[PDB]
Amino acid sequence: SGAIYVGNYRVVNRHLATHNDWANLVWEDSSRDLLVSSTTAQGCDTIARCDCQTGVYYCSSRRKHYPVSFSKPSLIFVEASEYYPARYQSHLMLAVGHSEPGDCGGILRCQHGVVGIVSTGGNGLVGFADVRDLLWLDE
Ligand SMILES: NC(=O)[C@H]1CCC(=O)N([C@@H]2CCCc3ccccc32)C1
Ligand SMILES: [Zn+2]
């Protein structure tokens, strides 16, 4: 589980969004596993605006933050699961690291701020849904 709180927005994995998120929906994209909903209070996270390929992510299944190298956002095949059939997920970045389904929502950050959240995993890999192209999150 996990979310990014920037301004009056809440960014979560779309497969983990709640009633309030859908009711106060701002934007969603199934092909990116992302959902943004409006909030009453202001958040304090800063979104990174950069091309960094190194950062640190939180792994809840290990209670540990791991430094990682990650690929650029891409269209990657994601095997079928209980939340989606087999499909290509867009704006996805992979790293070699531990990831379990309950790890989705864990933040990936660089020196510039939040890069994205855990979305995929298994086979000794971990995938992150990029949020750095979502410029409207800053306004
Ligand atoms: N974005 C998606 O299509 C995800 C939906 C929920 C979900 O569990 N996953 C995968 C399943 C395989 C193991 C695994 C480990 C860690 C994180 C995520 C997953 C894919
Ligand atoms: Zn950066």
Side-chain angles (χ1 to χ4, degrees), residues 20-94:
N20 277 144
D21 295 319
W22 283 108
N24 298 292
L25 174 69
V26 171
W27 169 87
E28 53 84 18
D29 188 339
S30 199
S31 85
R32 290 177 72 150
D33 185 41
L34 286 179
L35 183 146
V36 173
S37 60
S38 51
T39 69
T40 88
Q42 274 245 318
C44 303
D45 292 328
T46 295
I47 308 305
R49 303 298 180 192
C50 68
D51 57 10
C52 284
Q53 279 191 254
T54 62
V56 174
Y57 83 100
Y58 177 65
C59 179
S60 76
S61 65
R62 292 286 179 272
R63 294 189 188 125
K64 221 253 169 212
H65 301 255
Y66 292 106
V68 282
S69 291
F70 53 94
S71 60
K72 290 189 158 179
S74 299
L75 193 57
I76 296 291
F77 187 76
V78 171
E79 258 291 16
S81 69
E82 90 178 77
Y83 300 100
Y84 299 101
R87 81 214 205 280
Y88 288 86
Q89 180 162 321
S90 61
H91 304 262
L92 186 63
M93 302 174 289
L94 306 182

Side-chain angles (χ1 to χ4, degrees), residues 115-139:
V115 175
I117 52 175
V118 176
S119 187
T120 84
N123 288 344
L125 299 161
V126 55
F128 310 100
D130 186 56
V131 304
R132 297 176 292 181
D133 66 318
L134 302 177
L135 306 188
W136 54 266
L137 283 171
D138 296 342
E139 48 194 21

